[PDB]
CSV table of N, CA, C and O in Angstrom, one decimal:
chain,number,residue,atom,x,y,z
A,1,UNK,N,0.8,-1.2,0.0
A,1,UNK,CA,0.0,0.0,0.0
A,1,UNK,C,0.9,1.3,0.0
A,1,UNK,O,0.9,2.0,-1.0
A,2,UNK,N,1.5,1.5,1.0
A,2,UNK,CA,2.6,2.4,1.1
A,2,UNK,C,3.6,1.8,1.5
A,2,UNK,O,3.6,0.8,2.2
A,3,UNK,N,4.9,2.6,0.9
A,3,UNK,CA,6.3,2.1,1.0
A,3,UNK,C,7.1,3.2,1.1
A,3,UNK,O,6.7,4.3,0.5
A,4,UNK,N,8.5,3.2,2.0
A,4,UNK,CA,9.7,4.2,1.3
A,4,UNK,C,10.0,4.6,2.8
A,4,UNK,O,9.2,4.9,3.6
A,5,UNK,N,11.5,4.6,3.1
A,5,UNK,CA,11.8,4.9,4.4
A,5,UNK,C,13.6,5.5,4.3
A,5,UNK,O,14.5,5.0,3.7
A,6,UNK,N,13.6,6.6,4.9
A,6,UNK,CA,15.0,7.2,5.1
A,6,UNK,C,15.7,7.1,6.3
A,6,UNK,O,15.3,7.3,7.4
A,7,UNK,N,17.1,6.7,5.6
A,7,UNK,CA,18.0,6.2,7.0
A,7,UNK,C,18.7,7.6,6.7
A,7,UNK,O,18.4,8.4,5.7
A,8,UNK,N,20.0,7.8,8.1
A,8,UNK,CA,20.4,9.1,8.1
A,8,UNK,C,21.3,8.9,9.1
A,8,UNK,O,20.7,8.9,10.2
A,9,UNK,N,22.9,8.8,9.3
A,9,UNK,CA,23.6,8.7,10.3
A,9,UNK,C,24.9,9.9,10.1
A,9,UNK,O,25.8,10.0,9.2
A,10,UNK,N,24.8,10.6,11.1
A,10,UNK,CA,25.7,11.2,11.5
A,10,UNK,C,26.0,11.5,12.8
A,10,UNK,O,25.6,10.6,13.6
A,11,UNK,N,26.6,12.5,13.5
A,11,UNK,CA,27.4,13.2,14.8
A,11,UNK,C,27.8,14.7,15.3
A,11,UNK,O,28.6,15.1,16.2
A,12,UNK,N,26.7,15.3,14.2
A,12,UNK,CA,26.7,16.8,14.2
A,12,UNK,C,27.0,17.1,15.5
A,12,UNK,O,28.1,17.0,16.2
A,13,UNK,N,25.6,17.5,15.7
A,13,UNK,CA,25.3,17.8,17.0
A,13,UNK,C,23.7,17.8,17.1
A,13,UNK,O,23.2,17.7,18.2
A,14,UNK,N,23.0,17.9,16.0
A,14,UNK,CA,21.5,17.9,15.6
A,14,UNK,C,21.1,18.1,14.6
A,14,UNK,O,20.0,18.7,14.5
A,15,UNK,N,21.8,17.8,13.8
A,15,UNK,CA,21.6,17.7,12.7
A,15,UNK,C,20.6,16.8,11.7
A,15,UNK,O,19.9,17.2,10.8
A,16,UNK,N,20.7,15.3,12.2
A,16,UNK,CA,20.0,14.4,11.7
A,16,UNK,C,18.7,14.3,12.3
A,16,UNK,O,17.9,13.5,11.8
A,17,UNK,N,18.6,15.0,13.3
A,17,UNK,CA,17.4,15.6,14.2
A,17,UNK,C,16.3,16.6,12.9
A,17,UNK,O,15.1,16.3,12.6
A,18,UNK,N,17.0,17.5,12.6
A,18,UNK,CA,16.5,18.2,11.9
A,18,UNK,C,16.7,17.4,10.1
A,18,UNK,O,16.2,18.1,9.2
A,19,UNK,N,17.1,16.4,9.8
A,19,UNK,CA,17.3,16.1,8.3
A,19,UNK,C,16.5,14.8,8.6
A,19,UNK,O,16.0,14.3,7.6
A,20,UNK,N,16.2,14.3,9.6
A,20,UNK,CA,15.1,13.1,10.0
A,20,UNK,C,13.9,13.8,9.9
A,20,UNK,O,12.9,13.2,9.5
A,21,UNK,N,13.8,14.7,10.1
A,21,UNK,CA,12.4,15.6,10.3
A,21,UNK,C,11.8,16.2,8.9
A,21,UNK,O,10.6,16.6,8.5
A,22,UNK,N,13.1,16.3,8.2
A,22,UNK,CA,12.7,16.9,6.2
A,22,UNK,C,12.2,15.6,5.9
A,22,UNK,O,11.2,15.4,5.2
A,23,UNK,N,12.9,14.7,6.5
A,23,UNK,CA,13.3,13.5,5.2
A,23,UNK,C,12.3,12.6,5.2
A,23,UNK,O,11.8,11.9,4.3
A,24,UNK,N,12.0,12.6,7.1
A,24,UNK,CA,10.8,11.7,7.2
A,24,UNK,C,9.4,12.3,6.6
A,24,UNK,O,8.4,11.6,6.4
A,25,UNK,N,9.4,13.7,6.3
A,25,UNK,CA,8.7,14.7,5.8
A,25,UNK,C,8.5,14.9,4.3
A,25,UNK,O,7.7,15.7,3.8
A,26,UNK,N,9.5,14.0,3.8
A,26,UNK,CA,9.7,13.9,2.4
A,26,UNK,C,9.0,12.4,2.1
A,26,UNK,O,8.5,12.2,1.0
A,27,UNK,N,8.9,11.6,2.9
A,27,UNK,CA,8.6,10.0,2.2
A,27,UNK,C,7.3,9.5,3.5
A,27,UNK,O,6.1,9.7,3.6
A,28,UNK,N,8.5,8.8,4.5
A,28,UNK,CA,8.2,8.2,5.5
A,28,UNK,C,8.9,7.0,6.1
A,28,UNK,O,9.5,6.1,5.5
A,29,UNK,N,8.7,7.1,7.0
A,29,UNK,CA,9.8,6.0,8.1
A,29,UNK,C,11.0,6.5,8.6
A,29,UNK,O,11.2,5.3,8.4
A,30,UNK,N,11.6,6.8,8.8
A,30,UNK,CA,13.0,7.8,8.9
A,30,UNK,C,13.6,7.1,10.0
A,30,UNK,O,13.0,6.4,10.8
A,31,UNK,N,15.0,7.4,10.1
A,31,UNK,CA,15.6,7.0,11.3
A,31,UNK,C,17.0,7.5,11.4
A,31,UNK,O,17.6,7.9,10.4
A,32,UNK,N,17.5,7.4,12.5
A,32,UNK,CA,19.0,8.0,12.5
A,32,UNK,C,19.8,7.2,13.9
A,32,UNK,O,19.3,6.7,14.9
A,33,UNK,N,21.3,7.4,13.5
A,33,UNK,CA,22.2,6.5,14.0
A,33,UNK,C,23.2,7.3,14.5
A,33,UNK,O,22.9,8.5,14.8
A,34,UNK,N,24.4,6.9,14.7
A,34,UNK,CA,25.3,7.5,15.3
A,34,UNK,C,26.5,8.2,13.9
A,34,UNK,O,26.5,9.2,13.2
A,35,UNK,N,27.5,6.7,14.2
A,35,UNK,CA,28.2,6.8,13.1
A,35,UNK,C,27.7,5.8,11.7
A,35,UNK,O,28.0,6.1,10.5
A,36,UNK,N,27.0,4.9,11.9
A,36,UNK,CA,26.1,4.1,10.9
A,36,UNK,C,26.7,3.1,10.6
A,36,UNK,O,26.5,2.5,9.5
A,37,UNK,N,27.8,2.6,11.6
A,37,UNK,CA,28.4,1.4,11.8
A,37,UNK,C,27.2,0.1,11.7
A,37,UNK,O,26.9,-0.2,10.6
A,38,UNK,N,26.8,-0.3,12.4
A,38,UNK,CA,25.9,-1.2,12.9
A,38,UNK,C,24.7,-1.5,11.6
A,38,UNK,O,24.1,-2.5,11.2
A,39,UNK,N,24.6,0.3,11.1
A,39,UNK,CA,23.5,0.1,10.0
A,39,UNK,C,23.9,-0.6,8.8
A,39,UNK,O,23.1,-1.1,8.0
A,40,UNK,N,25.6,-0.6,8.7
A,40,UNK,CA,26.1,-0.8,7.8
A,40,UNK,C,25.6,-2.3,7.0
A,40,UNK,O,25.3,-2.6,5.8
A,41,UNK,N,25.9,-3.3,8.8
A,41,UNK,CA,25.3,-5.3,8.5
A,41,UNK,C,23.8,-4.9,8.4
A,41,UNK,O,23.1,-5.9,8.4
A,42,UNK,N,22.9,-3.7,8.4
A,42,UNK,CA,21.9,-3.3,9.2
A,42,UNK,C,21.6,-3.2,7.5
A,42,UNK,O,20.6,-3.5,6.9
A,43,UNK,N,22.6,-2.9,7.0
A,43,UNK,CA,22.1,-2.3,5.2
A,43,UNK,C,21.5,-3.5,4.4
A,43,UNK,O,20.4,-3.7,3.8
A,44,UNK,N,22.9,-4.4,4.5
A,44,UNK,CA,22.3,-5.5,4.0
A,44,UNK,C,21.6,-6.7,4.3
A,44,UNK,O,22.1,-7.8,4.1
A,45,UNK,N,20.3,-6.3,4.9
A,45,UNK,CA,19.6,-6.9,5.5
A,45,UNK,C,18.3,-6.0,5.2
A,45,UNK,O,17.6,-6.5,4.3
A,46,UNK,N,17.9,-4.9,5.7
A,46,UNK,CA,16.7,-4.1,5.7
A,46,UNK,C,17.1,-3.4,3.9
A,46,UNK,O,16.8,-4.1,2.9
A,47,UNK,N,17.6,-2.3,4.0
A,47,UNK,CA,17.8,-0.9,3.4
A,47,UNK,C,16.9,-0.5,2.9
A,47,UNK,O,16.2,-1.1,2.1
A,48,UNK,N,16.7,0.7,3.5
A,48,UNK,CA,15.7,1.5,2.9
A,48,UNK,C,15.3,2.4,1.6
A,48,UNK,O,15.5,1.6,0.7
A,49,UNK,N,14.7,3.5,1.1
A,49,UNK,CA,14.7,3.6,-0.6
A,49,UNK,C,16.0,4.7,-0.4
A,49,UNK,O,16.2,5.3,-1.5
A,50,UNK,N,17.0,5.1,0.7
A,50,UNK,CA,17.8,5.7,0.6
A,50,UNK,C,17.8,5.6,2.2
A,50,UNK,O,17.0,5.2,3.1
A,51,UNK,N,19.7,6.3,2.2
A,51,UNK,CA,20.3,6.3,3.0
A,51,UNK,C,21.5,7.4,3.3
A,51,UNK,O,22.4,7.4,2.4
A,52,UNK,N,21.7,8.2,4.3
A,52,UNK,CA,23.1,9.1,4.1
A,52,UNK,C,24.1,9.0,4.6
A,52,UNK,O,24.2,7.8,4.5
A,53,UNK,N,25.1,9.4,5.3
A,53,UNK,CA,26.3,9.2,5.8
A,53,UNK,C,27.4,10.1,5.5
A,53,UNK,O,28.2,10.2,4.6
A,54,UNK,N,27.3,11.1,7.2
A,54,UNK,CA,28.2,12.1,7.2
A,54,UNK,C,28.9,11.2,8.7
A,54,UNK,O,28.5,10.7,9.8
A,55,UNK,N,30.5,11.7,7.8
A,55,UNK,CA,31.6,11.1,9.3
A,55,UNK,C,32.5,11.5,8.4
A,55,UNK,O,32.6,12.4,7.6
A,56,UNK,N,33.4,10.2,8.9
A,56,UNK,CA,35.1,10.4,8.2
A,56,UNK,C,35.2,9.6,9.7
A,56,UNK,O,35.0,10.2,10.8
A,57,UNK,N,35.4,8.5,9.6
A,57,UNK,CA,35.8,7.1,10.6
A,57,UNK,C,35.5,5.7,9.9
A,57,UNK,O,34.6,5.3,9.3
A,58,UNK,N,36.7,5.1,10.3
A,58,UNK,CA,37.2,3.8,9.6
A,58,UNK,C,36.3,2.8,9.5
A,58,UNK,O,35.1,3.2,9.5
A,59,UNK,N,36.5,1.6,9.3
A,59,UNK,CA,35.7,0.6,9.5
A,59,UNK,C,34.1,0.4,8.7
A,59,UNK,O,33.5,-0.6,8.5
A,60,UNK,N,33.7,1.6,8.4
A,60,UNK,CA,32.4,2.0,7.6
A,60,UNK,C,32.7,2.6,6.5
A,60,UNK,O,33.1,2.3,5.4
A,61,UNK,N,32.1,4.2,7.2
A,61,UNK,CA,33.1,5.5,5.9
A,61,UNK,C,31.6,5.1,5.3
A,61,UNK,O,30.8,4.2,5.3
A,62,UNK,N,31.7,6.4,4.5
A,62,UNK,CA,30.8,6.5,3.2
A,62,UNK,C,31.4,5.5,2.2
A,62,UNK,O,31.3,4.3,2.3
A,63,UNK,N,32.2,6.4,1.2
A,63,UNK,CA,32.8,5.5,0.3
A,63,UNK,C,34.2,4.3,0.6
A,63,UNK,O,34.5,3.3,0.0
A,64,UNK,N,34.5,4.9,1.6
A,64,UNK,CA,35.3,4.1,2.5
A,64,UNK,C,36.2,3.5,1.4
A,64,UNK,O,36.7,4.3,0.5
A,65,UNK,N,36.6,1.9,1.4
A,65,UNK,CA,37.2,0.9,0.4
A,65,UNK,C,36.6,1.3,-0.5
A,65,UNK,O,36.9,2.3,-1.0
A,66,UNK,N,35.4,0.4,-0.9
A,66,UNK,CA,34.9,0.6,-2.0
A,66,UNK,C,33.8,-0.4,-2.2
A,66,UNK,O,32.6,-0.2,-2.5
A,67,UNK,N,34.6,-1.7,-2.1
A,67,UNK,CA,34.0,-2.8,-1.9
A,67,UNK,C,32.5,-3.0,-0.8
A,67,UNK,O,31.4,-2.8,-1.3
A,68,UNK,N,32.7,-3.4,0.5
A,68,UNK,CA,31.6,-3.4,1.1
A,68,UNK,C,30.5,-2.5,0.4
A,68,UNK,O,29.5,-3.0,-0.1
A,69,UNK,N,30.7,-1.0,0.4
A,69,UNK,CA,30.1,-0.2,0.2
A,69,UNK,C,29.4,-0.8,-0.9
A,69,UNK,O,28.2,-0.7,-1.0
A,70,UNK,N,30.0,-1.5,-1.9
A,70,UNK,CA,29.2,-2.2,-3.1
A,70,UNK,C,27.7,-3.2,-2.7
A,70,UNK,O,26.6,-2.7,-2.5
A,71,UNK,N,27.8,-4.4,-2.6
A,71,UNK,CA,27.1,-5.0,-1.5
A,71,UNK,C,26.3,-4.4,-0.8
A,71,UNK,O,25.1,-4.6,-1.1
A,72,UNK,N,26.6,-3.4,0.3
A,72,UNK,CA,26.0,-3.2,1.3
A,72,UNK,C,25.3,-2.1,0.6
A,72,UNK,O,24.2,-2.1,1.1
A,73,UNK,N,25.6,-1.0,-0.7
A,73,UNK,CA,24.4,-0.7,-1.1
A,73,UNK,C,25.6,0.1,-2.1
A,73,UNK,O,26.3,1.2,-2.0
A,74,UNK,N,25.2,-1.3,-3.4
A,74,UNK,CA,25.8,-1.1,-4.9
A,74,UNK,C,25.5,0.1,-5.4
A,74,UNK,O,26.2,1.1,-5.6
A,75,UNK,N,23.5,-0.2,-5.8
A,75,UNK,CA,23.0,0.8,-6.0
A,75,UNK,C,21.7,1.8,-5.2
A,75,UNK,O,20.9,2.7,-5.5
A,76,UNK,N,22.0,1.3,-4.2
A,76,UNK,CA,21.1,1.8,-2.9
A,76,UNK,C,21.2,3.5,-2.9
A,76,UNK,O,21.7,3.3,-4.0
A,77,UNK,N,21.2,4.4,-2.8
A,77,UNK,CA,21.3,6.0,-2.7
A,77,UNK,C,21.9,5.7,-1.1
A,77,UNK,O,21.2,5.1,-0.3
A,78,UNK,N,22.9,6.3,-0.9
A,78,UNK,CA,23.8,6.5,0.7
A,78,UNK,C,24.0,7.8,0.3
A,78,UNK,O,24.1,8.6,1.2
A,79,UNK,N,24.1,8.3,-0.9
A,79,UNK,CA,24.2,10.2,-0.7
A,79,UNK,C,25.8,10.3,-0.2
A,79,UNK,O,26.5,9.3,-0.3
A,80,UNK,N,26.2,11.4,0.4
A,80,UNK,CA,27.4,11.3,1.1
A,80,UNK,C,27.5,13.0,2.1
A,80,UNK,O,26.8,13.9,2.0
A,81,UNK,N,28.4,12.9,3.0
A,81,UNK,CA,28.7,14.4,3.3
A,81,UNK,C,30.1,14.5,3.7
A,81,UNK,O,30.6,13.4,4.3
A,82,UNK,N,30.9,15.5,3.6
A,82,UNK,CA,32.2,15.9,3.7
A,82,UNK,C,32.3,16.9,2.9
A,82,UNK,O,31.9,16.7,1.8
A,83,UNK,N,32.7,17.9,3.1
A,83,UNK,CA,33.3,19.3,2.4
A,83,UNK,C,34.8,18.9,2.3
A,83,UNK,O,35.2,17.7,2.2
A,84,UNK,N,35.6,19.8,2.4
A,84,UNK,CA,37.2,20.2,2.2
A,84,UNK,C,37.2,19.2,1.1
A,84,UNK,O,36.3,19.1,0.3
A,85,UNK,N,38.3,18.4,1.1
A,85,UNK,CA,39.1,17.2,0.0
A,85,UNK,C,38.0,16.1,-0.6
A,85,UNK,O,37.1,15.7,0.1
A,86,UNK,N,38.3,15.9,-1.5
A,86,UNK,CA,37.1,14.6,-1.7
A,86,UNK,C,37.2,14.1,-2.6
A,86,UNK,O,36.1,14.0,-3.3
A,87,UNK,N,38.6,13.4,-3.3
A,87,UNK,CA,38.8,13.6,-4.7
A,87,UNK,C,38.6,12.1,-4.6
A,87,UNK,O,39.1,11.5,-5.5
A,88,UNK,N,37.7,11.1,-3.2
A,88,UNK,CA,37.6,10.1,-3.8
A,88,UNK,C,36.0,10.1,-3.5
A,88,UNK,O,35.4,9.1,-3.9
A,89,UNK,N,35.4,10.8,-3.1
A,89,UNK,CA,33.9,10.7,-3.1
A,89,UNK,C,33.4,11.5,-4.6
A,89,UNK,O,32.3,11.5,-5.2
A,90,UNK,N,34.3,12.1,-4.8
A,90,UNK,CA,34.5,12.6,-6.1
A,90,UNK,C,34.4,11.9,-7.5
A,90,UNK,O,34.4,12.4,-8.7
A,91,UNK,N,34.4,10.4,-7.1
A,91,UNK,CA,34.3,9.7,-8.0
A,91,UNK,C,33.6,8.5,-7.9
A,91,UNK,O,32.8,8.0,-8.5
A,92,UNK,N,34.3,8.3,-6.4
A,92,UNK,CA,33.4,6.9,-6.0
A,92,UNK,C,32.1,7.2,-5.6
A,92,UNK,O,31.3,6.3,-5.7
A,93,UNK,N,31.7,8.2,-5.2
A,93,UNK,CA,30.1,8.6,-4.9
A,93,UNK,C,29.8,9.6,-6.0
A,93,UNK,O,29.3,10.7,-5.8
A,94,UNK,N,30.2,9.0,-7.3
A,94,UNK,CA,29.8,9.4,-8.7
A,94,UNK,C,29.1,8.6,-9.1
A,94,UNK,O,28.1,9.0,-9.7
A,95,UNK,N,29.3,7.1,-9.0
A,95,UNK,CA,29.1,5.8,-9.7
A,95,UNK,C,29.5,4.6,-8.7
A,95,UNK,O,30.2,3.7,-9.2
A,96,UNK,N,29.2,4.4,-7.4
A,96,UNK,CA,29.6,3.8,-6.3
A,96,UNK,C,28.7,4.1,-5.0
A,96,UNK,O,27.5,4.2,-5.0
A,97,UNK,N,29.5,4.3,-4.0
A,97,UNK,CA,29.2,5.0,-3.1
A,97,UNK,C,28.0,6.0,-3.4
A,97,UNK,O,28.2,7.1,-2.8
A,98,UNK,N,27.1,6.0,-4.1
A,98,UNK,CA,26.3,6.8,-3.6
A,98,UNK,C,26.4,7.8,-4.6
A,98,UNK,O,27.5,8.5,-4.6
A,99,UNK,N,25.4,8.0,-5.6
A,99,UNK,CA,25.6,9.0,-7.3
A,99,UNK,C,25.6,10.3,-6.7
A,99,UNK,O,26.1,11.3,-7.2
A,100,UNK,N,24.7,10.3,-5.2
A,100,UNK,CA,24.3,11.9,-5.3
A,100,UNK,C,25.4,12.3,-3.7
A,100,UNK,O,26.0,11.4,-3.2
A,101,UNK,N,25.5,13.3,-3.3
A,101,UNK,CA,26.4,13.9,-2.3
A,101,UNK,C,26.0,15.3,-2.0
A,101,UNK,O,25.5,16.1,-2.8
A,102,UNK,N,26.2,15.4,-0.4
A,102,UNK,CA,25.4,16.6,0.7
A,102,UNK,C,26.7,17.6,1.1
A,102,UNK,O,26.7,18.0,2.3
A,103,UNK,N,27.7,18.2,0.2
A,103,UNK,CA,28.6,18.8,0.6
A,103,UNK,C,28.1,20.2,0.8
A,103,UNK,O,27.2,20.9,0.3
A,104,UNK,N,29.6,20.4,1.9
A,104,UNK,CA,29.2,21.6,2.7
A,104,UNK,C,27.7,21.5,3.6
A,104,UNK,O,26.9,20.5,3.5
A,105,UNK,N,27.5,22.9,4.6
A,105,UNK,CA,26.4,22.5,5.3
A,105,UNK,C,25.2,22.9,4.3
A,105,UNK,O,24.8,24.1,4.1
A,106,UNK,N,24.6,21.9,3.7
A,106,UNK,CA,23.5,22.2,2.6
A,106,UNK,C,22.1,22.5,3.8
A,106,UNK,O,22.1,22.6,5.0
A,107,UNK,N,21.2,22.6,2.9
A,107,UNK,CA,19.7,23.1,3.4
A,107,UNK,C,19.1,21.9,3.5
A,107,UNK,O,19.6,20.9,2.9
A,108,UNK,N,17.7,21.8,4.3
A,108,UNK,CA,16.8,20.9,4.9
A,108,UNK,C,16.3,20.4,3.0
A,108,UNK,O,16.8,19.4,2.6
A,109,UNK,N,15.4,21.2,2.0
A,109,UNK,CA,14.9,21.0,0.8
A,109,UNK,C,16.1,20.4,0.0
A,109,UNK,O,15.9,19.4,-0.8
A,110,UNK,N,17.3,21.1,0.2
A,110,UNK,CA,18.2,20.9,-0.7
A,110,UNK,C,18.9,19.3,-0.7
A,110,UNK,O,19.4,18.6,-1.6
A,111,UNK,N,18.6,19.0,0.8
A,111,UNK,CA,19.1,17.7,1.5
A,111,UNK,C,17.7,16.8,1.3
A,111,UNK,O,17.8,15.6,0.9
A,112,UNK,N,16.6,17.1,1.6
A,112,UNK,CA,15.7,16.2,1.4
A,112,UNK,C,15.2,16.2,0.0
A,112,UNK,O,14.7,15.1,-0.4
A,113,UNK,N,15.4,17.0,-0.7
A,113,UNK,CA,14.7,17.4,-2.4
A,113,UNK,C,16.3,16.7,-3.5
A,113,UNK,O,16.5,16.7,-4.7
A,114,UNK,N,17.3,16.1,-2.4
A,114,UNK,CA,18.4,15.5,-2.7
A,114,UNK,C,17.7,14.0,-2.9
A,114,UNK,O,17.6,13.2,-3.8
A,115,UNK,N,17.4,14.1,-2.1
A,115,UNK,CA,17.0,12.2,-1.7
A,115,UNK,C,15.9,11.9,-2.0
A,115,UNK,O,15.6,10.7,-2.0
A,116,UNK,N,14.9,12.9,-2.6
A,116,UNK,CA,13.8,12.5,-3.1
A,116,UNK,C,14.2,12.4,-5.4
A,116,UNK,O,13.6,12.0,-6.4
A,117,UNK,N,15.6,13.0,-5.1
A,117,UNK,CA,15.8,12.8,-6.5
A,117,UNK,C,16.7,10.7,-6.6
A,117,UNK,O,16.6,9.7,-7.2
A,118,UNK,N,17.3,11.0,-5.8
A,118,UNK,CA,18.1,9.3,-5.4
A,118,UNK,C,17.0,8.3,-5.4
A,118,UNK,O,17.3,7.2,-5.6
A,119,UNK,N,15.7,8.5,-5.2
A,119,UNK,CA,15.0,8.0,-4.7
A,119,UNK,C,14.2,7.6,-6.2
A,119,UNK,O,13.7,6.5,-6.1
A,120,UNK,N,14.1,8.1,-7.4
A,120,UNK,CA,13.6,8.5,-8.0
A,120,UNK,C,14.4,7.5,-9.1
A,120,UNK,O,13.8,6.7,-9.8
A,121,UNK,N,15.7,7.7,-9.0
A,121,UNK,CA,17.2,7.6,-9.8
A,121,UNK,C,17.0,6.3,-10.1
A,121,UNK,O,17.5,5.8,-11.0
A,122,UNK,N,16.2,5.6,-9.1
A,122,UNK,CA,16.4,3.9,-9.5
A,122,UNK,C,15.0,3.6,-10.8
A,122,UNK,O,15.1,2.7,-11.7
A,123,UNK,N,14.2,4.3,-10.8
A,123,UNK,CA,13.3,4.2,-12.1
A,123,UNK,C,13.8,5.0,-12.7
A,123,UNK,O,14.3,6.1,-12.4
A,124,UNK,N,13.8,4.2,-14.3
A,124,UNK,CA,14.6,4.6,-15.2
A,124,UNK,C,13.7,6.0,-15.7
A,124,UNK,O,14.2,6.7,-16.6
């Protein structure tokens, strides 16, 4: 009947507070995590019609390796976030990791009207 749920892990400070509140406001079901470790075996198992992931810590990472991130969500939308350097989210969250990306501190529409385009991206 109805379907579509957004995951959302970061460590702002309240951030995903407020991008849970667009996002769940954009679809439905929403949820948020820490660093999104846990969501990561959590991915490939549930995943939702999208997913985001702002940090910069090991063992996860957005585009991280490269690999897991395949698997755990080939073509799933993870989006991404990090400003300054990025010359590998620059590619790998081109066609990898995640086609679309939340750099710099973006806006609530711009971040949720992001994920409703990712969301979209899988119908041709």
């Amino acid at each position: 009947m109805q379907r579509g749920i957004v995951w959302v892990v970061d460590d702002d400070s309240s951030i995903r507070w407020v991008l849970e509140r667009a996002l769940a406001g954009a679809g439905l079901t929403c949820t948020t995590f820490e660093n999104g470790n846990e969501v990561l075996a959590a991915l490939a198992s549930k995943t939702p019609d999208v997913l985001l992931s702002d940090i910069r810590m090991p063992g996860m990472d957005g585009l991280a390796l490269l690999k897991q991130i395949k698997q755990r969500h080939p073509m799933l939308p993870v989006i991404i976030m990090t400003a300054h350097s990025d010359l590998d989210a620059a590619v790998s969250a081109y066609q990898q990791g995640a086609f679309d990306y939340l750099p710099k501190p973006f806006d609530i529409d711009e971040a949720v009207a992001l994920v409703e385009r990712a969301i979209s991206h899988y119908q041709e």
